[PDB]
Structure 1
């Protein structure tokens, strides 16, 4: 099986804006997670071909990753902070669906998610 195309990251038919929350999500949240020691599985779409995961895209229909999120932020793809937050949550959830408790990748997701949630608790005002 081929990989699916990656998620879209730019669309000139959507309106654009910068908000203080979206700024925080790129400059604080995304950049803090990106440099973490456990970021590496999450920095690009899951390459099911290269990683020998032939059922990955049979199970995961809404793939998401932080490379995609970073590009979406940088391209003003998101209008609402919640859309971005949702993408992070999808990314974690997919990892929990496909993998099992105690897998190394799950433990890495958990740690990154706890950090994510801490930072989201510190989002500034609308």
Structure 2
């Protein structure tokens, strides 16, 4: 635990988890369900908010920047994999703006 990881858990994750556009990101991408047989060929480090949440709950992270990189990977995966016109891209962008706004007020340490 750091004060920063606390803030990521209580402020950042809280605000994104309950957001109306969060639902595609709450669990790992299931490439079979979604009919995306090339997903895991393109995206080599899958990430999702449930995994990040579990990691915060279980004190997996050593530093805030580690959890921040996982959020980033999650969004980046979406931008890389999806078509520019896919609605999921706009959902991701919306959530990432919240993430950045909240991170701008995270404490030092």
TM over 0.5: yes
Runs of 4+ in structure 1 off by over 6 angstroms are: none
Q: Does 1:112 align with 2:95?
A: yes
The 3-state SS of whatever aligns with 2:34 is coil
Q: 1:86 aligns with which of 63, 69, 73?
A: 69
Q: Does 1:96 align with 2:108?
A: no
TM value normalised by structure 2: 0.98
CA RMSD of aligned residues (A): 0.6
Q: Which residue of 1 aligns with 2:56?
A: 73
Computing the radius of gyration over CA atoms, which structure comes out larger, 1 or 2?
1
User: Looking at both structures, which has the greater relative contact order when contacts are Cα pairs under 8 Å and sequence separation is at least 6?
Assistant: 2
The 3-state SS of whatever aligns with 2:32 is coil
* 1:61, distance to aligned residue in structure 2 (A): 0.2
Q: Does 1:123 align with 2:103?
A: no
Q: CA separation in 1, counterparts of 2:85 and 2:64? A: 31
Q: Deviations over 1:82-111 (max 9, x none)?
A: 000000000000000001222100000000
Report matched runs for 1:1-126 at 5 Å: 18-126=1-109
TM value normalised by structure 1: 0.85
Count of residues in correspondence between the two structures: 109
Q: Which runs of 5+ in 1 are unaligned?
A: 1-17
Q: Where is the helix percentage greater, Structure 1 or Structure 2?
A: 2
